[PDB]
Amino acid sequence: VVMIKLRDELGTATTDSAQKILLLGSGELGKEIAIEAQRLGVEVVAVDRYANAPAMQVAHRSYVGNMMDKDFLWSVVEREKPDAIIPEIEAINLDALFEFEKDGYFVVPNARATWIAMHRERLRETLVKEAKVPTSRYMYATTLDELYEACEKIGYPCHTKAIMSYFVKGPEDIPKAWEEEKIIVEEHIDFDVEVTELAVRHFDENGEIVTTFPKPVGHYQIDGDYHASWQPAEISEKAEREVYRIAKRITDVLGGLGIFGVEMFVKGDKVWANEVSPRPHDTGMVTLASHPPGFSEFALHLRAVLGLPIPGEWVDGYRLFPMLIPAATHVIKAKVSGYSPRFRGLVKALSVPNATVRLFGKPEAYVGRRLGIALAWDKDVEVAKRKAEMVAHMIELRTRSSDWHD
Amino acid sequence: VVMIKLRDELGTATTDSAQKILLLGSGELGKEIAIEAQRLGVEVVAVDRYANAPAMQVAHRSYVGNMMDKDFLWSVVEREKPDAIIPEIEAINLDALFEFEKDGYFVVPNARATWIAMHRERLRETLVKEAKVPTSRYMYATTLDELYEACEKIGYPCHTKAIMSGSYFVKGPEDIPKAWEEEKIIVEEHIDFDVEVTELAVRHFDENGEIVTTFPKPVGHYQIDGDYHASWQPAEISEKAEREVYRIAKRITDVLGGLGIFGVEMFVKGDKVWANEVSPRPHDTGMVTLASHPPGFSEFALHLRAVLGLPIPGEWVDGYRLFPMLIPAATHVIKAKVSGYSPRFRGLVKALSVPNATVRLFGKPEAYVGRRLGIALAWDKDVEVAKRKAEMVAHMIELRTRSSDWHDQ
Ligand SMILES: Nc1ncnc2c1ncn2[C@@H]1O[C@H](COP(=O)(O)OP(=O)(O)O)[C@@H](O)[C@H]1O
Numbered sequence: 001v002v003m004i005k006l007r008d009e010l011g012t013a014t015t016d017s018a019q020k021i022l023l024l025g026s027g028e029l030g031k032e033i034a035i036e037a038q039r040l041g042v043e044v045v046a047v048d049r050y051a052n053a054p055a056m057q058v059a060h061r062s063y064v065g066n067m068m069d070k071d072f073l074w075s076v077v078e079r080e081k082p083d084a085i086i087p088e089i090e091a092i093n094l095d096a097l098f099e100f101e102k103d104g105y106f107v108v109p110n111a112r113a114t115w116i117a118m119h120r121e122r123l124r125e126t127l128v129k130e131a132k133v134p135t136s137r138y139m140y141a142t143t144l145d146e147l148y149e150a151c152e153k154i155g156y157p158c159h160t161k162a163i164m165s166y167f168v169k170g171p172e173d174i175p176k177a178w179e180e181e182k183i184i185v186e187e188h189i190d191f192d193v194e195v196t197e198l199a200v201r202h203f204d205e206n207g208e209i210v211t212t213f214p215k216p217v218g219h220y221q222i223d224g225d226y227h228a229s230w231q232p233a234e235i236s237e238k239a240e241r242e243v244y245r246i247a248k249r250i251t252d253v254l255g256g257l258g259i260f261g262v263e264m265f266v267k268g269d270k271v272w273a274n275e276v277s278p279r280p281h282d283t284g285m286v287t288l289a290s291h292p293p294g295f296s297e298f299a300l301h302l303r304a305v306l307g308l309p310i311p312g313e314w315v316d317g318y319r320l321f322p323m324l325i326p327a328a329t330h331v332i333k334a335k336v337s338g339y340s341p342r343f344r345g346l347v348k349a350l351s352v353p354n355a356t357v358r359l360f361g362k363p364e365a366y367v368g369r370r371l372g373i374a375l376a377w378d379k380d381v382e383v384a385k386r387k388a389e390m391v392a393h394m395i396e397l398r399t400r401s402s403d404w405h406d
Numbered sequence: 407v408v409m410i411k412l413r414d415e416l417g418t419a420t421t422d423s424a425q426k427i428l429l430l431g432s433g434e435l436g437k438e439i440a441i442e443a444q445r446l447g448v449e450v451v452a453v454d455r456y457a458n459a460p461a462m463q464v465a466h467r468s469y470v471g472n473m474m475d476k477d478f479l480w481s482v483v484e485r486e487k488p489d490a491i492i493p494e495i496e497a498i499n500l501d502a503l504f505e506f507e508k509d510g511y512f513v514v515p516n517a518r519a520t521w522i523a524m525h526r527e528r529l530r531e532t533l534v535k536e537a538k539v540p541t542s543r544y545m546y547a548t549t550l551d552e553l554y555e556a557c558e559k560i561g562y563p564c565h566t567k568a569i570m571s572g573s574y575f576v577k578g579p580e581d582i583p584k585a586w587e588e589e590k591i592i593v594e595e596h597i598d599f600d601v602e603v604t605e606l607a608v609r610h611f612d613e614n615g616e617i618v619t620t621f622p623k624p625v626g627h628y629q630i631d632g633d634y635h636a637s638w639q640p641a642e643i644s645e646k647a648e649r650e651v652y653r654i655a656k657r658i659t660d661v662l663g664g665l666g667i668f669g670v671e672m673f674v675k676g677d678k679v680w681a682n683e684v685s686p687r688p689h690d691t692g693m694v695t696l697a698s699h700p701p702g703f704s705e706f707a708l709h710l711r712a713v714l715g716l717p718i719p720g721e722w723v724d725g726y727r728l729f730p731m732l733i734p735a736a737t738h739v740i741k742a743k744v745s746g747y748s749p750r751f752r753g754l755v756k757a758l759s760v761p762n763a764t765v766r767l768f769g770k771p772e773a774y775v776g777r778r779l780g781i782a783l784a785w786d787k788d789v790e791v792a793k794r795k796a797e798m799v800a801h802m803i804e805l806r807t808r809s810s811d812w813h814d815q
């Protein structure tokens with residue numbers, strides 16, 4: 001069960017009455033968690049493998065070290081004795097997380113959830129066997145011959161993914177997929193849209209854990225990287241209810257406190273569970289504009305894990321979290337590498353009404369690195385989507401030793 | 407004149423391409439400017455007279471010292487060479503601000519504005535002689551003899567105010583000696599107004615590189631003993647009064663000049679509007695914009711964008727460039743009734759269960775009686791519902807310090 005209880009009080013950061021969170025992973029999602037913590041006077045310690053990471057800049061103190069090293073993490077935890085340990089990435093020493101928890105430290109949402117989400121087979125079997133939710137048809141392959149059999153049985157086109165990816169359209173792609181050993185082979189779902197349901201487990205006034213559901217977030221990606229997201233996804237009411245049902249079955253199995261990014265595919269009224277991250281997810285950055293102040297996915301996660309309540313509205317057996325206005329995001333990604341990134345095109349980009357940008361503060365860029373986002377809002381979610389894309393495309397980037405790129 | 411120009415580029419904090427702001431005063435208003443700066447990858451250095459002030463906690467670096475000491479401030483400015491020096495309070499060495507500007511550092515909105523606004527006579531004369539806007543009738547007194555004649559000439563009840571940094575509500579001649587005790591004084595006629603409003607006019611560059619002024623909806627509020635207690639947007643005033651508020655604010659900010667947001671204070675009675683005073687920087691009543699304006703557009707973000715030379719989108723209406731509100735909202739302060747270190751707040755299960763509201767706790771390490779430690783924020787389609795809700799949420803919170811018992815409000 002959950003180690004903490006419903007919270008009625010907060011002290012003040014930098015004094016002996018402070019509450020304290022420890023962010024393991026200091027990227028842009030951790031930065032927004034740190035800003036909400038600062039806005040509540042909660043002390044923030046940010047940890048990552050490099051210095052001046054986004055969340056470290058906003059945090060009260062930081063630690064830099066190899067987050068796969070259990071002894072480094074224990075040293076930080078023993079020094080800081082945080083009220084919540086918030087892992088922001090899967091590349092963290094898993095044994096360490098279980099040991100913190102066994103020793104009484106609150107690991108968010110629990111250590112087991114991160115461990116499960118770490119392994120594709122473990123995760124898929126949990127969804128099928130424990131949560132009992134619908135997923136793409138699939139089979140596993142341990143050898144090249146098994147891969148041929150799987151793709152043929154599943155049917156082309158199919159997706160192959162290492163359990164820890166390739167899109168095989170025909171047998172000619174089998175050799176490539178095998179080179180990308182265990183692999184999961186999945187049937188291709190020709191969905192209308194992919195959605196992330198940001199279900200949050202948190203205490204109600206009785207001290208029991210309730211699950212609250214924001215509107216589904218639609219998104220699209222260039223395989224591996226989300227490129228744009230928006231809220232609400234334009235899906236039917238039946239699909240929406242089914243999205244909540246499936247998310248609830250999954251978060252009931254994972255347990256603990258915190259927000260989850262439950263990923264699903266939607267086609268008409270049909271919904272398939274794809275996977276789930278037991279923490280805030282990048283597509284949810286849209287909630288920085290679509291949810292009211294103090295209620296983005298980062299503030300919801302923070303409130304949940306400190307044991308604070310979160311208001312919601314019960315609708316047909318589901319406790320929903322009302323959206324403020326439709327919104328959308330579009331990533332600003334580096335096409336070059338190097339130190340001291342710079343961004344231009346702001347006169348045009350920042351003159352667009354109902355939109356703005358957030359630049360993450362990363363000190364170095366690498367090709368494909370997300371450096372910021374454009375955010376836009378409108379009564380019409382499609383107008384917000386086009387607008388965020390437009391603003392992001394007006395921005396060009398350069399580093400110390402590179403030329404400008406669009 | 408403004409020494410920077412329209413900005414099309416931003417670098418990254420902590421690296422050599424960084425832009426950098428220097429906050430002189432690190433209270434709750436500076437903390438929110440620091441948060442928007444961090445959100446844009448802008449480097450923040452926060453200064454104040456005590457350590458771990460609200461903005462210092464969010465800033466990249468901080469300096470602690472007597473901000474009335476010109477040498478201290480120069481040492482910081484020479485070390486940091488910021489793109490903008492942002493005074494958050496009036497109690498800053500004024501000669502220092504003029505010297506920074508003379509040496510090519512950008513003081514917001516300009517040094518003269520802070521020097522004018524901190525002196526009731528320089529300010530009032532600026533409003534009457536240069537901006538040419540309506541104000542309460544007034545007279546100045548430098549002696550008790552002049553004070554008696556002034557109060558008699560203005561008529562009772564009248565307001566007496568010390569020219570710098572001690573006011574009194576004179577109901578009759580018998581109060582005159584008490585007022586002299588609180589030396590220059592301004593004596594004003596009493597204005598019977600319906601509500602006081604803060605117009606958050608912001609001067610900034612437009613896409614063409616010229617300076618324009620944009621107007622958010624007026625913010626209503628109520629001042630209890632020199633301290634605001636609650637504010638809300640939009641103020642419930644007539645459309646005629648609203649346009650007069652914009653007209654008066656424009657005349658005032660065109661005279662003060664520079665770049666940045668201004669908190670122009672006015673009294674409203676029906677369609678009639680009187681200019682009261684003006685703060686040349688973000689103002690506490692404007693915290694309502696943390697909820698009533700869209701993300702990245704509270705008064706703090708409007709100020710930051712303006713002083714970095716970035717554009718701010720607006721909507722032209724009847725000759726005025728307006729800034730659209732997202733949803734009506736209100737705030738109510740959370741003030742300490744006791745003093746001491748390590749404040750703590752309780753009542754959160756009930757207070758944070760109220761829908762469409764939340765709280766911001768400033769992080770101040772010590773409380774003193776009357777110190778503002780946080781605010782409740784609430785929004786609703788109906789501004790009166792938001793006003794009542796912010797008040798209810800604030801009243802659900804009790805506070806204590808390391809060496810005090812729990813106290814309501
Ligand atoms: N079975 C599938 N059918 C259709 N599209 C899929 C399928 N599996 C993955 N994808 C697509 O590949 C990307 C998601 O990959 P996924 O395995 O869910 O995440 P990761 O690869 O980041 O673990 C998205 O474009 C998703 O739509």
Ligand SMILES: Nc1ncnc2c1ncn2[C@@H]1O[C@H](COP(=O)(O)OP(=O)(O)O)[C@@H](O)[C@H]1O
Pocket residue numbers: 542565567573594595596597598602629632682683
């Ligand atoms: N001339 C006036 N008529 C009526 N009320 C006034 C007048 N001047 C001040 N007040 C009241 O006193 C409050 C404080 O005003 P003022 O002294 O000018 O600002 P500060 O509180 O910054 O000195 C005003 O907000 C208003 O409530």
